[PDB]
Design a binder for this molecule. Structure first.
Ligand SMILES: [Ca+2]
Ligand SMILES: [Ca+2]
Ligand SMILES: [Ca+2]
Ligand SMILES: [Ca+2]
Ligand SMILES: [Ca+2]
Ligand SMILES: [Ca+2]
Ligand SMILES: [Ca+2]
Ligand SMILES: [Ca+2]
Ligand SMILES: [Ca+2]
Ligand SMILES: [Ca+2]
Ligand SMILES: [Ca+2]
Ligand SMILES: [Ca+2]
Ligand SMILES: [Cl-]
Ligand SMILES: [Cl-]
Ligand SMILES: [Cl-]
Ligand SMILES: [Cl-]
Ligand SMILES: [Cl-]
Ligand SMILES: [Cl-]
Ligand SMILES: [Cl-]
Ligand SMILES: [Cl-]
Ligand SMILES: [Cl-]
Ligand SMILES: [Cl-]
Ligand SMILES: [Cl-]
Ligand SMILES: [Cl-]
Ligand SMILES: [Cl-]
Ligand SMILES: [Cl-]
Ligand SMILES: [Cl-]
Ligand SMILES: [Cl-]
Ligand SMILES: [Cl-]
Ligand SMILES: [Cl-]
Ligand SMILES: [Cl-]
Ligand SMILES: [Cl-]
Ligand SMILES: [Cl-]
Ligand SMILES: [Cl-]
Ligand SMILES: [Cl-]
Ligand SMILES: [Cl-]
Ligand SMILES: [Cl-]
Ligand SMILES: [Cl-]
Ligand SMILES: [Cl-]
Ligand SMILES: [Cl-]
Ligand SMILES: [Cl-]
Ligand SMILES: [Cl-]
Ligand SMILES: [Cl-]
Ligand SMILES: [Cl-]
Ligand SMILES: [Mg+2]
Ligand SMILES: [Mg+2]
Ligand SMILES: [Mg+2]
Ligand SMILES: [Mg+2]
Ligand SMILES: [Mg+2]
Ligand SMILES: [Mg+2]
Ligand SMILES: [Mg+2]
Ligand SMILES: [Mg+2]
Ligand SMILES: [Mg+2]
Ligand SMILES: [Mg+2]
Ligand SMILES: [Mg+2]
Ligand SMILES: [Mg+2]
Ligand SMILES: [Mg+2]
Ligand SMILES: [Mg+2]
Ligand SMILES: [Mg+2]
Ligand SMILES: [Mg+2]
Ligand code: NA
Ligand code: NA
Ligand SMILES: [Zn+2]
Ligand SMILES: [Zn+2]
Lengths: 594, 594
């Protein structure tokens, strides 16, 4: 357990992946979402002493051949003996031996293994030499991207060195590294090295199970790049993956050069990521531009959280290939309705169930204003689905409008012939009565934006809202006394604080006669309640006091706290009453500039 | 100072570099080795209130043109007005404005500025449009490596986004980012954008001050790659840099294709590193393979700790160029004696002062075994320099022997005709009597290794060392009684513990007669003091007990603690007495297996 020169051999629970480390720093944490079991023993070569803690004694080093046995690579040792490599790695020189573990030899195909045992003089010797370098190279010398000639026919050894400490040779991970030998060093790797493929393109053209992906590739003029030099990571979708897609989707993406090209580039990484370098979740930029999330669940590689990898670490002269169960479809290749996620299903179901999905033609460009599922109450879903169909028609535009194109005062046109006002604030974008959330996406033929509430375009003007309610009567009269009816009737952008008749019943009529004598003070007192521009409370950043200049001249202060709108530190009763030419906030008492 | 919505404008002491941040996380630390001065004020748009801390009030947003004034870019505002760009950035649409600061316009060349003021209708408008994007892009949207078309002739804007948070456009750093406008966003940049060069190669061919580097480039066949697409960082050495080198060095490197090619690739980075992204020291891999250290002292860019950059941020369609005062010479292009550093100067002076430097021919391959300066005592430097010349001749090999080629039992041949034994241990490599330190380097025509002590090849065998000292007399007799003289005379590798005559004077002769009757126990008792192989105490790892198998059979335990060799927990008097065929450790009393 505790002591000097103690080594821990961990194994991820539920897998065969083993990680061998010294006890210098704590290495204990979940790997690939799973805990590990640990085996403590003296690091190879070190020994225990009586009455002492740990392993304070050490044995002398041996030659490379004996070090094969010191590290437990007894099968590699036997094969080294049978091929007469033993006498070379016992003599003069300095050698690096990437020795496959015993389990690595057990995992090798039986026909290949028997083929090696039947030709020990040449083929077996050439394979073991393929596992070797004619110089001593520690793991700190095996830099990422190095191509080091081996000891057989100068065959290239492709080194990868990752920030997490994983060192791979032809994607074979080094389990036990840096066992010093009198004439070299031994590193125990997790698989037997094999002949690398010619290139990724050549593997695609050769493999029949990648026929579909090949065709698409040749259609997208991207297969040529996968044959040139480089260090790519390709997530190749098999023919099963293409069969999984809905009908016509593959035909639709293939019929369009842009969607097909983006679809192809979305599977390719510009760097080499061996499977054994994945110890957790990370994001990687694809050639399409957008990223994919690569992770691991036990010994299963996950792509975008899906355990879709079935065959991994297909190494080739220009990078690695991992076969996957599904096709990776980037947003830039999806139809607009396909851009929605979980919290929009209701919306996307409704527009499908009420006959609007067919109106989103592939040759058109559209914008979906999708409310979250929480925005559809039972009372809303209980209305007649024709009215609900009109409402949904207020959430679809026949023009693609990206989030980066919206501006204050912009007017959007729904497919239902209605107009939507865009209000841009410092920290929020609100369309009519609904404000945007995060999660906007752009696709092949449109964009989608997520909203907290259902968008309901206003139907009454300020004047109609004022005269339809009785509690505003007196105030309305004053507004008409100031010749503001034409303002409250014509289109525009205003913010009006409407004091109820209760505020004037705090004046009790007499002060309305005292104010009636003033044909000028009513202009100030009344005009202070009006402000140019539409300022809704749910568009503010919470807690911050907004200083606005009313049309009267003096300042007014609006603060949104706990979903309540305060005006001059006075809690308003009703707020965000939308009209066609402004917004109304109902206040309890009168407002003065002070 | 403290409060919400407070912004800090820092300036690196001694420079003009300003960094504008909000007070969300502590941003206060030295940048480029210098402290900063800080200016606290409400973030633009926010206001203070009576009796409140910080800036809890806010003003409404404005259009892009007014936001130019809100952020202090009043000169950009004036130029926008004079070119009639103002009415466009006040109207419909969504714009990103990379507004140069007032200081940025002051730094612009006066002739170019006056040329813009004399053609406001087209040229000035086209430049300001070159500073703009026709969509709203926050800094989080300006991903690294993006080439975003501007609003003039679709001119490319080269985005770089660094892990430290620095965002640059054509290497112009964004000082104040993300000022939201009703119709866009304003980012204040630190310089006026100019037309990017055609390519790095074209700038090299055009610039006369890079004539030398051009020639070398054309000689190394690397100038073609600097004209193809990419994102390179080139540290171009001027003709002054080449003039600085010693005589013939440039001719020597140019006459060799390998040294010239490595010399050229050592100046080139595979990624784009704008100067304003450098806030501290970091290492970068060059195209040659080895790394360079890039840092900053105030506003001076440092390369390998030298303030050699004089003109920086020469942006071109395929990367950035920084002109430097010196030539970057990688180890792979240096003669072997040029590989030594500070702690080897004495050595490199000696071999030069005693006439050995000329023997290191460029067409030969050599290995220097350089002791540190601390290894040359005054008594050593006081010997006749001819003996010292022989000693130095024991530190030079006429064959290149890399550190990764040394193996246990190897015999090296000095230029003085002497032989050096290589002893490889688990954690140390010792040559004869001296053990290696870190810092081995490889060059054009040799390698260098650093040693703690002067290498003195042994001259006497075990037998000669035994008979030349009287305190060993008795023991020597016993060794000759066991027929070991031929072993102590012939070459080999042994470790002998020699008990002095004081140990046998603890037996007082009589026990030598009691042992004299035993013609077999003397074989065990004597042979226990001998061990196959050479084990010197300074080759051990400190504190660890080395378990060795003596030639008698039983185990012996050697531990090096506080530069003292303990054998079976017995402090030895003298240790590491080197002989031609072994090593001697003088013990106080006899040794028994026990
Ligand atoms: Ca052995
Ligand atoms: Ca390492
Ligand atoms: Ca192991
Ligand atoms: Ca094409
Ligand atoms: Ca989702
Ligand atoms: Ca507004
Ligand atoms: Ca203005
Ligand atoms: Ca950012
Ligand atoms: Ca500023
Ligand atoms: Ca060439
Ligand atoms: Ca140095
Ligand atoms: Ca030895
Ligand atoms: Cl470790
Ligand atoms: Cl954990
Ligand atoms: Cl053990
Ligand atoms: Cl055997
Ligand atoms: Cl690891
Ligand atoms: Cl390792
Ligand atoms: Cl070694
Ligand atoms: Cl990871
Ligand atoms: Cl994770
Ligand atoms: Cl239907
Ligand atoms: Cl219906
Ligand atoms: Cl876009
Ligand atoms: Cl309207
Ligand atoms: Cl916003
Ligand atoms: Cl109503
Ligand atoms: Cl005021
Ligand atoms: Cl910030
Ligand atoms: Cl500091
Ligand atoms: Cl202030
Ligand atoms: Cl003006
Ligand atoms: Cl920063
Ligand atoms: Cl910033
Ligand atoms: Cl905006
Ligand atoms: Cl940095
Ligand atoms: Cl630093
Ligand atoms: Cl001389
Ligand atoms: Cl001399
Ligand atoms: Cl090398
Ligand atoms: Cl010898
Ligand atoms: Cl070593
Ligand atoms: Cl002597
Ligand atoms: Cl024993
Ligand atoms: Mg094995
Ligand atoms: Mg690899
Ligand atoms: Mg396929
Ligand atoms: Mg792997
Ligand atoms: Mg929904
Ligand atoms: Mg938003
Ligand atoms: Mg009223
Ligand atoms: Mg509100
Ligand atoms: Mg300015
Ligand atoms: Mg840039
Ligand atoms: Mg030059
Ligand atoms: Mg810069
Ligand atoms: Mg020296
Ligand atoms: Mg060493
Ligand atoms: Mg004696
Ligand atoms: Mg010692
Ligand atoms: Na606001
Ligand atoms: Na040792
Ligand atoms: Zn205002
Ligand atoms: Zn031994």
């Amino acid at each position: 357990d505790q002591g000097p020169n103690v080594c821990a051999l961990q194994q991820i629970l539920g897998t065969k992946k083993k990680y061998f480390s010294t006890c210098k720093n704590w290495y204990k944490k979940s790997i690939c979402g799973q805990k590990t079991t640990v085996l403590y023993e003296c690091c190879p070569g070190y020994m225990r002493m009586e009455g002492m803690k740990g392993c304070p004694a050490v044995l002398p080093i041996d030659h490379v051949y004996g070090t094969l046995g010191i590290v437990g690579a007894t099968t590699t040792q036997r094969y080294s003996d049978a091929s007469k490599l033993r006498e070379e790695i016992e003599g003069k020189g300095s050698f690096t031996y990437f020795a496959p573990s015993n389990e690595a030899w057990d995992n090798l195909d039986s026909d290949i293994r028997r083929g090696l045992e039947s030709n020990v003089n040449v083929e077996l010797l050439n394979a073991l030499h393929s596992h070797m370098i004619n110089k001593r190279m520690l793991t700190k010398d095996l830099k990422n991207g190095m191509i080091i000639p081996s000891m057989y026919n100068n065959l290239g050894l492709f080194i990868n060195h990752y920030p997490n400490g994983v060192v791979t040779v032809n994607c074979a991970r080094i389990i036990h590294g840096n066992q010093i030998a009198t004439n070299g060093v031994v590193h125990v790797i997790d698989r037997v090295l094999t002949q690398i493929g010619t290139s990724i393109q050549d593997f695609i053209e050769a493999e029949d199970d990648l026929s579909s992906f090949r065709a698409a590739a040749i259609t997208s003029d991207i297969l040529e790049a996968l044959g040139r030099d480089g260090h790519f990571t390709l997530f190749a979708p098999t023919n099963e993956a293409f069969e999984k897609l809905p009908r016509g989707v593959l035909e639709r993406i293939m019929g369009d050069k842009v969607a097909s090209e983006a679809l192809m580039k979305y599977h390719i990484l510009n760097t080499l990521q061996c499977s054994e370098s994945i110890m957790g979740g990370a994001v990687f930029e694809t050639l399409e531009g957008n990223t994919i999330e690569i992770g691991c669940d036990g010994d299963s590689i996950t792509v975008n959280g899906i355990k879709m990898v079935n065959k991994k670490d297909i190494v080739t002269n220009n990078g690695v290939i991992h076969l996957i169960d599904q096709v990776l479809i980037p947003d830039s290749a999806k139809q607009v309705i396909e851009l929605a996620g979980k919290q929009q299903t209701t919306f996307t179901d409704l527009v499908a169930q009420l006959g609007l999905a067919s109106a989103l033609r592939p040759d058109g460009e559209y914008t979906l204003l999708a409310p979250v599922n929480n925005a559809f109450s039972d009372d809303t879903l209980s209305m007649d689905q024709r009215l609900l169909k009109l409402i949904l028609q207020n959430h679809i535009l026949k023009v693609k409008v990206g989030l980066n194109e919206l501006y204050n005062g912009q007017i959007l046109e729904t497919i239902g012939g209605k107009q939507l006002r865009v209000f841009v604030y410092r920290t929020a974008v609100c369309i009519e009565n609904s404000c945007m959330e995060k999660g906007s996406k752009q696709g092949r033929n449109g964009a989608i934006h997520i909203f907290r509430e259902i968008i309901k375009p206003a139907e009454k003007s300020l004047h109609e809202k004022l005269k339809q309610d009785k509690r505003f009567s007196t105030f309305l009269s004053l507004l008409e006394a100031a010749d503001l009816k034409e303002l409250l009737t014509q289109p525009g952008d205003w913010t009006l604080f409407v004091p109820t008749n209760d505020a004037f019943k705090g004046m009790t009529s007499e002060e309305k006669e005292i104010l009636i004598r003033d044909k000028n003070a009513l202009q100030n007192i009344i005009l202070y309640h009006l402000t140019p521009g539409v300022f809704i409370g749910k568009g503010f950043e919470p807690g911050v006091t907004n200083i606005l200049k009313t049309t009267q001249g003096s300042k007014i202060f609006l603060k949104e706290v706990n979903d309540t709108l305060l005006v001059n530190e006075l809690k308003s009763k009703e707020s965000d009453i939308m009209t066609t030419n402004g917004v109304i906030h109902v206040v309890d008492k009168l407002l003065y500039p002070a």
